[PDB]
């Protein structure tokens, strides 16, 4: 009964058609695309240092793993990680990287992740008004270390919804992760996390997406980002060898 009158009587191939339930369904069918990789990222705050982690799978040997990456350095002080197919991640990445710029040409400073999640999300709405473009099947995360707000995470979905979480994950496996840090925060009642160094905060976030994820991870199956004042960048592989020795 739920989508039976949907799948039969249209309502599932035009974007701009409501159902008598009120629900439009096309965008509500976009999200199935986000999980077409079986991939599962993460993000958390700091005292001044932010981090985001992603798997990086082990397909057939012929790839050149230097280039497979879902972490795109947008501008300085900014970065982003996607959840969805690669091509529908670029067109969002590039429509942005030429958007932080003109701001800095037209207003005299660099955009935060506030506006950058309000702008790019003020567009994916529009493409769910008009028939210009199928809505990009993604759900993307932003990061930054701002001057006026400190660390900051934000999030954007194909409708246009955006909220700045305190910590979050995404993918097929949110419930397992999200509980393995929701319960952590009610312990301490700190929106941020301790361990001043951007180093020591990584190893916090790794191990929580090991115990609650479901297996053990090497250096190659991961790719990780970080945000610090004046910079955004990626990382090396030793941070786990200096974990299990301590344990």
């Amino acid at each position: 009964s739920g989508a039976a009158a949907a799948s039969a009587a249209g309502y599932d191939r035009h974007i701009t058609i409501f159902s008598p339930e009120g629900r439009l369904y096309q965008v509500e069918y976009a999200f199935k695309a986000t999980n077409q990789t079986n991939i599962n990222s993460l993000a958390v705050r700091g005292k001044d240092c932010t981090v985001v982690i992603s798997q990086k799978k082990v397909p057939d040997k012929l790839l050149d793993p230097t280039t497979v990456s879902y972490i795109f350095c947008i501008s300085r002080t900014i970065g982003m990680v996607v959840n969805g197919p690669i091509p529908d991640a670029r067109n969002a990445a590039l429509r942005a990287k030429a958007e932080a710029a003109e701001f800095r040409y037209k207003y005299g400073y660099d955009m935060p992740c506030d506006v950058l999640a309000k702008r790019m999300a003020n567009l994916s709405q529009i493409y769910t008004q008009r028939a210009y473009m199928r809505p990009l099947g993604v759900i993307l995360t932003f990061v930054s270390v701002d001057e006026e707000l400190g660390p900051s995470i934000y999030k954007t979905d194909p409708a246009g919804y955006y909220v700045g979480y305190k910590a979050t994950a995404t993918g097929p496996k949110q419930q397992e992760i999200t509980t393995n840090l929701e319960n952590h925060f009610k312990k301490s009642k700190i929106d941020h996390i301790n361990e001043e160094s951007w180093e020591k905060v990584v190893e916090f976030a790794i191990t929580h997406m090991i115990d609650a994820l479901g297996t053990e991870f090497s250096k190659n199956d991961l790719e990780v980002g970080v945000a610090t004042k004046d910079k955004f960048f990626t990382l090396s592989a030793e941070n786990i060898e200096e974990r299990l020795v301590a344990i």
Partner: protein
Amino acid sequence: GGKHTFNNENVSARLGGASIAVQAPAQPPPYSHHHHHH
């Protein structure tokens, strides 16, 4: 003159077909050419 019986039974099957129905929702296209496609 005759002692046999007959015993006319219903050994035969039978059936009555008027399976008349109502809906027929088969296939409405309201997008015969998607009406400018855009």
